[PDB]
Amino acid sequence: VRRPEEFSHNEIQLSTGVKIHYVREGSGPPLLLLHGWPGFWWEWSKVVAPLAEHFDVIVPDLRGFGDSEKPDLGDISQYTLDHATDDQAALLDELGIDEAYVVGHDYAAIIVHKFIRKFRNRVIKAAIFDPITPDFGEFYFGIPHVSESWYSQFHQTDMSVELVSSSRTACKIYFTHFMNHWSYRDELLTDDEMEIYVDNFMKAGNIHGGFNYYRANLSMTSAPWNELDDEVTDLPVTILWGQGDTVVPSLLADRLPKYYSNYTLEIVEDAGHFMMVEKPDIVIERLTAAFK
Amino acid sequence: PAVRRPEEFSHNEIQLSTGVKIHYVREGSGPPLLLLHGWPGFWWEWSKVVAPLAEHFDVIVPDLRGFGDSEKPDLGDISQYTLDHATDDQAALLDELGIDEAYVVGHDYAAIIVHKFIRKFRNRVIKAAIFDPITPDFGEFYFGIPHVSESWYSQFHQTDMSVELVSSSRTACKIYFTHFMNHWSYRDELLTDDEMEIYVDNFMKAGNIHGGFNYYRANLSMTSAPWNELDDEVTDLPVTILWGQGDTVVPSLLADRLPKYYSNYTLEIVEDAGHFMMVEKPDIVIERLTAAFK
Ligand SMILES: [Mg+2]
């Protein structure tokens, strides 16, 4: 287990008005790895050094997460996924990168979906794990998947922030459920690993900032998708799907042709929602091979 | 120390033909009147209306199985937490008290219990009243869009983590339940802090958190069917319906569904009341029940 401090840390101010934290190492074509919720850059820790043999690996914290800036926590409008998508192109800008390989899942599955249609000329190839497409809502908020999406509505309440942040123990109890339930195997993280997550989420504004994503993009009056996002894209895309993902299940894969005309699909039977945590060997091999 | 303390009632615990030990308080002289709580709650949610009602009724206020000081059936066996069981418990309690027929009042989970009781045990009801009723119709709306913004908690309770988090301390327990007491109420703050501490005292008892959540696992999981073909019966029992317009979880726009199941009822929408009519507007409860049950 390679700890957060055993990485090379950076912080820069982007044109989008927000300060973004990221780690970086390796040499080669740029490779941007984007986390979701629950998460922050460190969820990719198992795969950074191996990929750094072939890529300039760049792993930022999304705004509202990790050590990146939390916009005014009372301003839900700064937590749209469109903002976080613009943050990624502005990061490449600030680093003098013309185009990059892009990888995302969970919330970052939407960012990548948006990114390669709005910033097509900034992406070489892309990969998405357990992708989420504009037609996801009808299922996600439907019967019986409401059994799984309840947390998105929990996070609209002020009491959710108050309860989850009431102590380290309450924080660990809450987040431990999603890491395991959304995973193929019964226990995803070692206790020490989970403790590093609690360290992260007990940072000022991180519980609140993460829930604002749900208030900004998954409320009953939220409209996070754009007309642009309905475009079929012919970008070469690598799709991996964890058959164990209970919240974004692999059966939704029959919807990919609605939006992608040139993709590979691999359903991993013994993986769930966190491919880079549970099956890092696979993430490493397929990205190295797909990205030349 | 500003409301009738829970110690200041006449308590009794009784084993029933159904196999559970039921706890209840009782006082008053008159025709019998059974008052049934829901979630979050226990017998003491009716405490503001018991003594005023006890001047004309024989008030009987039990803890539902899984709640309060009533027995928790095996917590790993959700089959013992269906609303059919809790309805039978009410008849079993009348039996054990020598009561042939009673006035009956229910809301929330007890709104369902009453719906079933007045159809299966019509022989045992004089008249009934339901606050913010819940009909067999309910699921399509409760789990529909956008009400999933309000029913998330029913699915939260399916998880093991919900029990682990909410029982983690008095603080967590109080933060959690405070949300529902207030959010489901017309006014911003339903309970005084001292009243809330009594609620926390109750839910920090062994199995009261787990047991309450089991009602959601037995009756409101996606594989549940708590309703029966009988419950589709249209009943002509005279039913008093009071509806809090500020109720966010069982909203009063649902009143158009009542004729589907009731042919002899009164309806009054209370503008400045929410999900807990007997807590937020105790006077209306007292005045309406005493008027209807004469
Ligand atoms: Mg699992």
Author numbering:
A (entry chain A): 12 to 303
B (entry chain B): 10 to 303
Question: Any passages from the paper?
Answer:
ELW1. A gene (ibcK) encoding a hydrolase is in a putative IB catabolism gene cluster on a ~222-kbp megaplasmid. The purified protein rapidly and stoichiometrically hydrolyzed IBO to MPD with a specific activity of 29 µmoles min−1 mg protein−1.
The adjacent α-helical “cap” structure, residues 147–228, consists of five α-helices spliced between strands β6 and β7 and oriented perpendicular to the core domain. The two cap domains interact in the dimer, composed of helices α5, α6, and α7, burying eight hydrophobic residues from each monomer, again characteristic of a dimer interface. The active site of IbcK is in the cavity between the core and lid domains, as in other α/β hydrolases. The active site residues described for EchA are conserved in IbcK. This includes the three active site residues located on loops of the core domain: Asp 117 on the “nucleophile elbow” between β5 and α3, Asp 256 after β7, and His 284 after β8 (AD1 Asp 197, Asp 248, and His 275, respectively). Electron density in each of the IbcK monomer active sites was built as a glycerol molecule, which was added to the crystals as a cryoprotectant. The glycerol is positioned with two hydroxyl groups within hydrogen-bonding distance of Tyr 162 and Tyr 225. Of note, access to the active site is blocked in each of the six monomers by an unidentified molecule. The electron density was modeled as poly-carbon as a placeholder (chain K, residue UNL).
